[PDB]
Amino acid sequence: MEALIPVINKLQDVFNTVGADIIQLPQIVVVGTQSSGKSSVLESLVGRDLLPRGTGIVTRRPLILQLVHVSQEDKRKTTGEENGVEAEEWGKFLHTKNKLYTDFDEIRQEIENETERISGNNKGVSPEPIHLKIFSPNVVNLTLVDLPGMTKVPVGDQPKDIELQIRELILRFISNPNSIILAVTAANTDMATSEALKISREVDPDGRRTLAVITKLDLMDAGTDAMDVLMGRVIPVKLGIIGVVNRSQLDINNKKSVTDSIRDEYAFLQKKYPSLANRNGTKYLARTLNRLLMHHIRDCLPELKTRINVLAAQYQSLLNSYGEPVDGSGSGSGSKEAADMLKALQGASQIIAEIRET
């Protein structure tokens, strides 16, 4: 069976700067607040540190994190220059193309060196996603689209006007009918007022395409647990409620391994939620997400294939509606967009066509 996650992965890369919203690609979108621990969720799935936290302040553009599983025998010569130790894990950024990152702290640096910046226009929000492939024998095949974290308070209850732009960005990504919403909220807070769930009901009134992750189960008050939320008694999300306890900042600084953290996570779930421990934790989360993404992709595959063809026809006609000049130094802004789109649509259709097995 041809794995379909690598296929959409390539489709995501194809519509990198030419606009992917109109394609409506099947993908998981991570929506969370700034203090929800959603960045810890990503790293728990990765297996080690990757994302720049907020020593002072956090990220300002989407990160398409593509975890690609490999055999432990599948390795890479360490670069940039000198030898000879061989790497078991490596990363690739789309903007740097075939450059190889063996030092995972250099990957973090590149994310920093690529997030925000006084580039282009307006202020610090770019809906331009960063594309990152992580090759590892410790990850399951999984792709997540990480969006900038919201404020834990409503937008009106904080001073910065740029928070509106963050809310717009998130809505832009999750209004995609074929997008699965991964809403990350800490048990540390009051669930029925979570900004993550609030903004998710605006595009998905029902819980029909939203999955809720409950983090920081070990930080709840005295004499209080997350039994009702984890039993599915309060939060109106339909793809399931999954509770985890990731590494804290203390643990990261104390260099606690993710293997040791999932061990303690496991012990915690067994202790406090014995009747539910089997359907919670990082290991359960990673693989439910893998299967759900696989099932969701092939459901959308037929309708996605024709949409690329239909779009190509509409774009072709749009250029016939356009006219001149076809010549030399200037295309103009709009006609070049249609031309570049058709090129991407061509590359997209080719990728789909290469899917074998009748």
Numbering used by the authors: 1 to 327, 703 to 733
What does the paper behind this entry write?
DNM1L is targeted from the cytoplasm to the outer mitochondrial membrane (MOM) and is a key player in mitochondrial fission. Similar to previous studies for human dynamin and Arabidopsis thaliana A (AtDrp1A), we designed a fusion protein comprising the GTPase domain (G) and the bundle signaling element (BSE, B) of human DNM1L (the so-called GTPase domain - GED (GG) construct). The stalk (S), which participates in higher-order oligomerization, and the B-insert were replaced by a GSGSGSGS linker, which continued with the C-terminal helix of the BSE. The GTPase domain of human DNM1L consists of a central eight-stranded β-sheet surrounded by seven α-helices and two one-turn helices resembling the GTPase core of mammalian dynamin-1.
In the nucleotide-free form, a citrate from the crystallization buffer is bound to the P-loop, mimicking the phosphate moiety of GTP. Apparently, the citrate compensates charges in the active site of DNM1L, while the GMP-PNP occupied active site exhibits a distinct conformation in the P-loop and switch I. In GMP-PNP-DNM1L, the side chain of Arg53 extends to the bulk solvent above the GTP-binding groove, whereas in the nucleotide-free form, this side chain is hydrogen-bonded to Ser40 and Glu43, in a position similar to that of the nucleotide-loaded dynamin complex. This translocation in the nucleotide-free state may be an artificial charge compensation for the negative charge of the P-loop bound citrate. Interestingly, the water molecule in our nucleotide-free DNM1L GG construct is in the same position as the catalytic water in dynamin-1. This catalytic water connects switch I with switch II via hydrogen bonds to the Thr59 carbonyl oxygen and the Gly149 NH, respectively. The overall root mean square deviation (RMSD) between the nucleotide-free and –bound DNM1L GG construct is only 0.69 Å for the Cα atoms, indicating almost identical structures. The BSE is formed by the N-terminal helices α1B (residues 4–16) and α1AB, helix α2B (303–323) and the C-terminal helix α3B (708–729, with residues S708GS710 from the artificial linker), arranged in a three-helix bundle with an additional one-turn helix. Both our structures represent the closed conformation of the BSE in relation to the GTPase domain, which has been called the “post-fission state”.
